[PDB]
Amino acid sequence: MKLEPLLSDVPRLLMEADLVPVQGTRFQPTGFPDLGAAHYEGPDGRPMLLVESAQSMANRLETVCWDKDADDWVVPLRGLPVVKVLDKAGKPLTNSVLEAHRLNSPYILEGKDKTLFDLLKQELAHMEEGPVDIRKLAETLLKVDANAVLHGVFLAKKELAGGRLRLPRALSAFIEAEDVRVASSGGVKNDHVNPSGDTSRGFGNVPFARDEYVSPRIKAYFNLDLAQIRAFGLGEQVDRLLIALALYKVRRFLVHGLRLRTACDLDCQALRVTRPEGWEVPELSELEAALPGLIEAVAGEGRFAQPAVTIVTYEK
Amino acid sequence: MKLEPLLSDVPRLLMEADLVPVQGTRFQPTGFPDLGAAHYEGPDGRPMLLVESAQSMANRLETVCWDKDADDWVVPLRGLPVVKVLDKAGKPLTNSVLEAHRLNSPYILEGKDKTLFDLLKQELAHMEEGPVDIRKLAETLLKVDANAVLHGVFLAKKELAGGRLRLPRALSAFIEAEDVRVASSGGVKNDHVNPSGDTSRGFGNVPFARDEYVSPRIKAYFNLDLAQIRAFGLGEQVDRLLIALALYKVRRFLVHGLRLRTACDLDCQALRVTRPEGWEVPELSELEAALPGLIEAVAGEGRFAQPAVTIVTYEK
Amino acid sequence: MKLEPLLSDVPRLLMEADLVPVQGTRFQPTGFPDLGAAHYEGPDGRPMLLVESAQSMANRLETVCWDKDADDWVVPLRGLPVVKVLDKAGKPLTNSVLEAHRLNSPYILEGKDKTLFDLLKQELAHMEEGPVDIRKLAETLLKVDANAVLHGVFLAKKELAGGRLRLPRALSAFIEAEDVRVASSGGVKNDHVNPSGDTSRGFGNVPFARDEYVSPRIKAYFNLDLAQIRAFGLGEQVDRLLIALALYKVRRFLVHGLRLRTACDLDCQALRVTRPEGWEVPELSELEAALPGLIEAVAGEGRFAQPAVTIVTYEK
């Protein structure tokens, strides 16, 4: 199955998914720590809502590839390089796919003993001072992390070139709602106040309120930066690998990732491409069938480090 | 069509372009160091925001025309003069096009090797007393690098005739959003949720606030000062060269700098011209074809220094 | 229309022109760093800003005519009296029309040898004692420098009658903006060298701040006191000449001084007269045609000294 030729010169891939609630007619947006529901006024003079940020979408698209039941990739993706962190007793604390800021985690790259630290220093020493090459950085990163190449990292740690080394996203997505109405609701924790009726110790009839939103058009947008992955220039095998991996993430999220929140019950009504016009998207079973071959090819080209999975122990 | 009729008709060239966000309805403007988003109140009585600084637009219009990996211009521009800065180990640490201070860059004119310093002093000695001839300076800049002619230079060095010499930029451009509106959305760290929130160790939890804007009209403005370059009087063919170089830079940025921040991604809806009225801008393929011949013509006029490329070594 | 009808009638001529920025809304006003932008509160309580100083508007009105490469007046103004200072080599250091203090300077009337010093002293000896007469000084200036009459002079040298002689400006103009709102901005000087960001040596990142302004009403005022020149009484033909010259200088400044600074790029929209009311100002082509004939007439009266151009050298 050929897909990279149809995406070998186009600068970016745009995909748009039309969502609808599974049951009822309402949904719950993300509770930002300051404002809660981040509603805003649209350019056309109509109310709009950021259903959830372009970060939560990324963390979900990143979880749908991992399996905590084994602390390893799902079988189709098995073999992709990843650093995994163990405690002093050998039980797995965390791995770089679940961490937030990748190799910049405080568990990773910082601790009592640091193998991956000396690896990163040995790799990037030539660029630690002066001009930085995003190709030499992207290859060093792909050596030890197979998906950060889609989400970026900031090597803030001062001893690593003062934090000069940086790399932005290549895949991004978010959900947006048009013409949002509001519904309001609340309740009271009506525990009987016969033995105690003071809220200080949690008794009483304490009330609460919460808001709910109604929108006739919710959209999930996905954007893939083909130009930058070409600008890495690691090889057409790597390019087709990363395109297939991104399509895989999107399909799995779209099929069974749409319970974003307890009251956020969502369904997919139709996916379509926006740019390039007239293209066709692979099916999920076809990506499942292709992925292990493309990963094998890239492993045979030696771009991955060996062993693919690398282990580090965390303690102060 | 040929471009010299415009060099006869008018004193200045004015263009504007309608930008639209590629997806969604909101974007990330520049974060200025002192204040963040540079919003202000408009004379018409409506709020608006400066998307980015005009000198950042200049650095981008320069970036879209040079390849640091190859250490040479894009194919149409090749052969134009430039100075490359060498490291003691022979690897090119930078060049005066990549750097933003052009000849004034502290790595240039400084260190144990300063051949370009004398190549300027040879005529700065004439400029030391009495008046200053802008056409003579513009000639000696065209002799060294045709980009400085386009973006201006200040020769602050005391030995360089007391730092008397300056030249304002002929091409200027900026983007601003009218009637802007605000959409705020913060976030929090996922990782390290279970352990203590000791932010000062780095081993902690951190929430943050983030803000992005909405606008019904974003425009990029481009201004080319024909009067000043004409008042250099270096020729007509050199004027054709500079106007082609500028209009190529515009078209070559209009399809590359469409994204400026990782969350700020736009596309051009249309391009329009203001001064002169009724003129039609040439296509990018036409400039691509014409430009090498104009460069060779001006080289045949003997304006460029020989060799066109200059090498200088920097140590400190 | 002829000029002398209004000169016989009215004591002063008042005109105003309302400006706009050609692109965008912001502009850069004058920047005396001991104050920065000069802002103040108006009579009606509104905030106010003088955009350009009157003395600098005058220096521009005197720099718009004359030509540096031709080293002489523009063709319409050609033939009017002037003095230029030559160096030892023989290339003119200082035309007097360009210089700040006009007929008073360390270059003219000061130096190892000086002819013009005696030429003025002879004509001012009878003004050394008793009351000074404006008519005699105005005659002497009109024979030596026909433009210094409109801008005024102060002969501070104690050798010239203790410096008692002085003459106020006849033409005054300035640019003023009303109901101003500020628009702050900034930037950073980036760097990419290997060793260190020593700002004391010019390396490393260095931020900076700048302030721009906007206004819904900005205009330039012009004032010419016909009473003052009528009080000089050099003649009706001389008055007609000076009125033509002033009008011409304004009508050309309006299409050559708009680019006051690198970031201002103003643009005139309309021009209106305030006193005399009901008058119609001439067009630029008419003054451009008429002016040489009036210079011929006044030369025929013998008011201009012969040779019209005075040559003098300077040596310490």
Author numbering:
A (entry chain F), B (entry chain E), C (entry chain D): 1 to 316
Authors' text:
Here, we report the composition, structure and function of the type I-G Cascade CRISPR effector from Thioalkalivibrio sulfidiphilus, revealing key new molecular details. The unique Csb2 subunit processes pre-crRNA, remaining bound to the 3′ end of the mature crRNA, and seven Cas7 subunits form the backbone of the effector. Cas3 associates stably with the effector complex via the Cas8g subunit and is important for target DNA recognition. Structural analysis by cryo-Electron Microscopy reveals a strikingly curved backbone conformation with Cas8g spanning the belly of the structure.
For this, the size-exclusion-purified assembled complex containing Cas7, Cas8g and Csb2 in the presence of a 72 nt crRNA was used for the structure determination. Seven interlocking Cas7 subunits which form a crescent shaped structure bound to 42 nt of the crRNA that threads through the interlocking Cas7 subunits were clearly visualised in the CryoEM density. We built the individual Cas7 subunits using the AF2 predicted structure as a starting model. The Cas7 protein adopted the typical central RAMP (Repeat Associated Mysterious Protein) domain with extended β-hairpin region. As observed for other type I complexes, each of the Cas7 subunits occupies 6 nucleotides of the crRNA with a recurring periodic pattern of 5 + 1 nt, with the sixth base flipped out in the opposite direction to the remaining five. A beta hairpin emanating from the adjacent Cas7 subunit is positioned along the phosphate backbone of the sixth base, generating the kink. This structural arrangement creates an unpairing of crRNA and a target DNA at these sites. We can also trace the 5′-handle of the crRNA, which loops back and is not bound by the Cas7.1 subunit. In our CryoEM reconstruction, we did not observe discernible density near the 3′ end of the RNA corresponding to the Csb2 subunit. With seven Cas7 backbone subunits, the type I-G effector shows pronounced curvature of the crRNA, reminiscent of that seen for type I-F systems.
